[PDB]
Every structure is written in structure tokens, then in C-alpha cells.
Enzyme design. Sequence first.
Site, short mmCIF file in Angstrom:
data_model
loop_
_atom_site.label_atom_id
_atom_site.label_comp_id
_atom_site.label_asym_id
_atom_site.label_seq_id
_atom_site.Cartn_x
_atom_site.Cartn_y
_atom_site.Cartn_z
CD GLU A 35 -3.08 -0.80 0.04
OE1 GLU A 35 -3.67 -1.87 0.01
OE2 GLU A 35 -3.15 0.12 -0.82
CG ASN A 46 -9.40 7.20 -4.55
OD1 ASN A 46 -8.74 6.42 -5.21
ND2 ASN A 46 -9.36 7.42 -3.24
CG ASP A 48 -14.37 7.55 -5.04
OD1 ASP A 48 -13.25 7.97 -4.72
OD2 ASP A 48 -14.67 6.39 -4.69
CB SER A 50 -12.89 8.96 -2.06
OG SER A 50 -12.81 9.41 -0.61
CG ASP A 52 -7.20 5.36 -1.19
OD1 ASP A 52 -8.38 5.05 -0.82
OD2 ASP A 52 -6.61 4.82 -2.17
CG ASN A 59 -11.97 5.52 0.50
OD1 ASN A 59 -13.20 5.57 0.39
ND2 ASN A 59 -11.21 5.96 -0.54
#
EC number: 3.2.1.17
Length: 129
Positions: A35, A46, A48, A50, A52, A59
Site C-alpha cells: 500500500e 480517486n 470519487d 475520495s 486514501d 479511504n
Amino acid sequence: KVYGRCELAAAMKRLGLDNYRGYSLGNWVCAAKFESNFNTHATNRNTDGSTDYGILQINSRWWCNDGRTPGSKNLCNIPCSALLSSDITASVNCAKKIASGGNGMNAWVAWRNRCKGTDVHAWIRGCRL
């Protein structure tokens, strides 16, 4: 902060992750590698809105408040910038809840992907633990 492998493996052993939900420490290691590459300030936006955050890339749309996600939760009470620090305490607290649910570590793709069915062991073999 880019972490040693064993510096990060000593840390979440103390932090409590070894055998947590019967996942042994190298699962943790390997999910952080894959990760974030052990970077705590690593961030990914992301499709959206979003984003992380930190080291096990939690997230913003389910577990944190970063300031702007056009509708969702905060399943952890953390402002997303706590993910982002030196200190893994918070990432690892939040991490436990994500893995408290049903799918367990399958919430991290990369773990799912680069880590299920491996020698995760291998991530702590030469360590100061």
C-alpha cells in the site's frame, strides 16, 4: 516519513498488530509496502473525490474526514490528517476496525493481490523484534 521495514515491523508489534484477527505481522508489513511503500504522507486521490491516506492508505469516503467527499461516513472519528503523521498509532487503530469487519484484510487490494498466498514471513525475516 519512509519507514524501515523492520523499523515499521517493530512498531506495529508494539502497536499490537501481530496475530490481530489471526493475521501475523508480515501481512501488515506487506500491505504497507504494497500500500504506501512505507511513506506516511503518501496520498492517492480517486475517481470519487475520495483520497486514501497515510501508510495503509485508509479511504476518506468510509473511515475519515479530509474536508470534502460529496457524501459519506467517518467509521473511525479521525480527521484524515492523523493518518498522515510520523506515528502510526492512528492508522493502525483505524486499520483494526476496517479489518474487524467480515472481509478482514481483503479491504487492501494490494494485500489481497501482492500478499494473500505468499511468505509474508519473509517481510520480517532479518528483524530486530
